[model samples]
Target chain A: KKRLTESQFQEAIQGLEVGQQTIEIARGVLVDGKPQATFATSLGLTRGAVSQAVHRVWAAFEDKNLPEGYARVTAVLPEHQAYIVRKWEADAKK
Target chain B: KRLTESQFQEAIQGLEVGQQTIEIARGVLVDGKPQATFATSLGLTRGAVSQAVHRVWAAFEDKNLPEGYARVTAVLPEHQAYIVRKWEADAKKKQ
Candidate 1:
């Protein structure tokens, strides 16, 4: 599987306007493959909270109009991750 | 319309045993009412998380196929929420 490079991850991190914790959760789950349970425990959060943050980050990458404060992304394949990085890079230009 | 005590009791007599959190998961994940931020804040402000859980439980006691059977985390929250909402609404309206 192709992993996202550090530069690309940082590009996405800087470009997106979502919360910092949401970015960490995305890295922990998408990059490190940490289980939600362990991640939640580390943050003193309920698993539901971590899960919700994941979807919020996922929603940021999508082009469609999601309901305010609600976004759902089911799959985060490598290409999708790449897409987010590319999208952010492009959005930074415009 | 208020769900009368007797009518409410009549409504939820058939759910499989599960945590009230399961239903809160359904409401936020499925119905999208009261956003997840609002749901989490119930723990911090709106009310006790326990209270929020019970209200959501009442909203959908008729849904769910037990926690493990559906593999809550393995399925995307939205799709899983759809299944939880879909199955029970069917069962309840049929009666």
Candidate 2:
């Protein structure tokens, strides 16, 4: 059985966290463009840096499960599941 | 009523088209990290250029609308409306 090592699991979780944060930030800016500076500051990155980070985050999302795409629903672990569900539902209703 | 001129619409739509293309490209590059010579050949403004593009792209999607955000019933143009609906559906299905 090829169980994920503890560190591997931790890294995966971190990557997922980064992805979620990146997605949430993207959504926030889409609503109002003015908050770019604030978002950058909070993230300890410049506006450009933030933008690039988002690109990387999206890339990461794609890279992790390429060929056959994975659903946001299945990507999330049980412990950190609510946000994906909530976001998917919210976007679906929009 | 300040309507966007035809040229303005073209510009916005053009930029949006570029954005969508960039997003599809980004999706394609997610896993392998295979370098894109074309992206490189374009003369990125900085090393962060590609990175910044990604960030802005992400920013566009990460909209936390206000608590009482009202739905735009007839705001978006018809073509854009359809694209939004389609993309939303795709994202929902994670396909």
Cα deviation in Å at residue A43, candidate 1?
A: 3.8
Docking class of 1: incorrect
**Model-by-model lDDT, in order?**
0.51, 0.43
Against the true structure, candidate 2 has what lDDT?
Answer: 0.43
Complex DockQ per candidate: 0.05, 0.03
In terms of lDDT, which candidate is strongest? Answer: 1
Query: B1-95, model 1: which lDDT tens digit per residue?
Result: 23334444443556443555544444554555564565574444545544554654564443333322221111123544354445445534643
How do the residues A1-94 of candidate 1 rate in per-residue lDDT, one tens digit apiece? Answer: 1233445456455666787788888777756767767879888999899888766555544433333443333321233333443454367457
lDDT score for residue A88 of model 1: 44
Worst 10 residues of 1 chain A by lDDT: A70-79
lDDT of 1 at A74: 32
How many times do residue backbones clash in model 2? 18
